[PDB]
Ligand binder design. Structure first.
Ligand SMILES: [Cl-]
Ligand SMILES: [Cl-]
Ligand SMILES: [Cl-]
Ligand SMILES: [Cl-]
Ligand SMILES: [Zn+2]
Ligand SMILES: [Zn+2]
Length: 229
């Protein structure tokens, strides 16, 4: 934790920009494993990227938003069908928040014992989201970079900031490994990491699932590790 970080229950929140916060929840393994997502203010509403590991943690995220921002959550986008990104879907739905995910994530979620988002995003051949499937997304720019950490992983740039969110695709610049590769596409991983970089070429702060925000060297280090697969 750095000066400025707010502890809220077992969750941590860090302001990254005037309208952007990182939310961090932890899965105790019998050490603790962090998972990061984003909260974005867009005028009189809030937008959320990824849930926490569990429903209770995700409800705590909503409680923090209520206390610190006091604006309604318009929608949440979840970036692939693993527990750290969709483990709290039920809490979003109980709150009446519209949820969005890659159509493939929604198709895979039941096979991971999880609940699909209520709306499906689809993507063009170059990876950009089809606009009709992402209505009223404000500053969220959703990009599917290709298979990598999983076949369904998506990424999100925040328009009007220098922030882009790589999810579990991107590792930090001093990472020793690519994290969990159990569902990974080792053939296409490097190209997908680089496609993420090319989609958001002016983002200087890269946010990822399991490390603190890093420079663009997170993207290049990840791609270089993936070259070795
Ligand atoms: Cl700031
Ligand atoms: Cl296209
Ligand atoms: Cl990972
Ligand atoms: Cl950009
Ligand atoms: Zn994952
Ligand atoms: Zn992950």
């Amino acid at each position: 934790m750095e000066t400025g970080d707010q502890r809220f229950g077992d969750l941590v929140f860090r302001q990254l920009a005037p309208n952007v916060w990182q939310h961090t929840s932890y899965l105790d393994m019998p050490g603790a494993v962090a998972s990061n997502g984003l909260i974005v203010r867009d005028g009189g509403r809030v937008l959320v990227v990824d849930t926490a590991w569990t429903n209770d943690q995700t409800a705590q995220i909503l409680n923090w938003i209520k206390q610190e921002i006091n604006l309604p959550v318009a929608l949440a986008v979840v970036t692939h069908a693993h527990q750290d990104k969709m483990g709290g879907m039920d809490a979003l739905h109980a709150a009446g928040i519209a949820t969005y995910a890659n159509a493939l994530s929604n198709q895979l979620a039941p096979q991971e014992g999880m609940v699909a988002a209520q709306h499906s995003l689809t993507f063009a051949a170059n990876g950009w989201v089809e606009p009709a499937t992402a209505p009223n997304f404000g500053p969220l720019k959703v990009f599917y970079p290709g298979p990598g950490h999983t076949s369904d992983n998506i990424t999100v740039g925040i328009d009007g900031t220098d922030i882009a969110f790589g999810g579990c695709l991107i590792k930090d610049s001093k990472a020793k490994s690519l994290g969990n590769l159990g569902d990974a596409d080792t053939e296409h991983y490097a190209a997908s990491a680089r496609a993420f970089g090319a989609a958001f070429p002016k983002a200087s702060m890269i946010v990822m699932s399991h490390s603190a925000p890093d420079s663009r060297a997170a993207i290049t280090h990840t791609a270089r590790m993936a070259d070795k697969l």
